[PDB]
């Protein structure tokens, strides 16, 4: 069920990403408040989809990128992160670097497009 | 920044597509006016995304297609267009053909889909 | 021997009333 994986480790939790995606979409004053809420839910959905587009991850639940992981963002063992932490804990640990990482993902995609425009079929 | 490249040449300006893309989503009477405005921004966004999907372009800021360029739309050099002209000038230069080109882009993708219905490689 | 290339995020505008 939805959020049933919240207490699971990151590795195990990642096994069920679709369930968390399918639950994002669904008197004058009352009517306006409800429209407010529905429009906003749509705007948030689209905002995240646009970022996946920008980063080159459109249409995927899991996407590999070309941005190296910085030891200054979080220095932990790969097995530590994936087997001994939940996603909530992880989010707190790196919340300060969220925008830094997003900025780098955007730059990476822009460079990739520049390389594609080359036509010598070489990076 | 946003529209900083507006006076730049098309070549130079093609490298700032991402910043422009990111700025598209960001009292009863007043409340209705604002909902009106928000809904329309969403509808326009989605229409552009649908066209790109129809043309076979999805999740890309730069997408190549199979439609030949007509000298009747614009008879100019590549160096002329990409190095000595801005996007605003270009948009005016070919505004007469916007719908013609769009119609052709759709037809090209439909033929591509027909070709993909073959299991035979079609070589 | 050129082909159409589609760009999205092009820095252009037109007059409008909103």
């Amino acid at each position, epitope marked *: 069920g939805f959020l049933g994986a919240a207490g699971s480790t990151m590795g195990a939790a990642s096994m069920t990403l679709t369930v968390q995606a399918r639950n994002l979409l669904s008197d004058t004053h009352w009517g306006i408040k409800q429209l407010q809420a529905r429009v906003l839910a749509v705007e948030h959905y689209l905002r995240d989809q646009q970022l996946l587009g920008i980063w080159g991850c459109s249409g995927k639940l899991i996407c590999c990128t070309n941005v190296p992981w910085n030891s200054s963002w979080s220095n932990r063992n790969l097995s530590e992160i994936w087997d001994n932490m939940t996603w909530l804990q992880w989010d707190k640990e790196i919340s300060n670097y969220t925008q830094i990482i997003y900025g780098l993902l955007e730059e990476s995609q822009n460079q990739q497009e520049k390389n594609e*425009q*080359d*036509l*010598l*079929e*070489l*990076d | 920044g946003f529209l900083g490249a507006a006076g730049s040449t098309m*070549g130079a300006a093609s490298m700032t597509l991402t910043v422009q893309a990111r700025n598209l989503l960001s009292d009863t009477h007043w409340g209705i006016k604002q909902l009106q405005a928000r809904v329309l921004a969403v509808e326009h966004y989605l229409r552009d995304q649908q066209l790109l999907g129809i043309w076979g372009c999805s999740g890309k800021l730069i997408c190549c297609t199979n439609v030949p360029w007509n000298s009747s739309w614009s008879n100019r050099n*590549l*160096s002329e267009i*990409w190095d000595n002209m801005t996007w605003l000038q270009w948009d005016k230069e070919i505004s007469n053909y916007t719908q013609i080109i769009y119609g052709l882009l759709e037809e090209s993708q439909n033929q591509q889909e027909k070709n993909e219905q073959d299991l035979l490689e079609l070589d | *021997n*050129l082909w159409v*290339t589609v760009y999205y995020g092009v820095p252009v505008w037109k007059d409008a009333e909103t």
Partner: antibody
Amino acid sequence: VQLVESGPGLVRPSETLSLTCAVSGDSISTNNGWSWIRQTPGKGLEWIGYINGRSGSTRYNPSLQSRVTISTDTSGNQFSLKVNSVTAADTAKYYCAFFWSTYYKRFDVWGPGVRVTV
Amino acid sequence: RMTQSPAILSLSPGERATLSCRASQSVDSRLAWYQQKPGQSPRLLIYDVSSRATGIPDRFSGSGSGTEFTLTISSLEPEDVAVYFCHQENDWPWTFGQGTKVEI
């Protein structure tokens, strides 16, 4: 851009052939497409390969991969070709060339070339 | 592998010259043509199937599709004595055809 080929005109089978090319008018490190190509009186012109001056990555003609290295020296603003096995069939005129091909432009720059005999 | 059939062509000034090339595999509309005057490094005449290279006279044109391509030289002015080559750029082994010679 101007390209100038240089190196020994006569080499033996046991020796490595080493040709360099000086590049003037631009920076090696900012361009892709730096290449070596050759002609033989009895053979059409063929590719040896190319190197990305910025990235260091290369592409080589499969028939020549086992004995061929292309590398650059961006401080010297030049680049070179090394062939580590030399045979009679390697007698050819060798050229330094720059191939620019992008979605918006296409051109070549060629050096005068050098004659190499085994 | 690329073949250029008119290995030797000899034509009087003013006579339009036709050169041709046949690829073993589709060129996918990426054929280029070069001119090599004796004693000189080759220069690019046509860089795409019908797209003319910078600084080249309008006299030079060409066409083709798939594997069949041609080069046309209008007028055939006296200066155009050279070996003409076809070049395939849509695969890795960018084969040059064996150029043919045109003599005034």
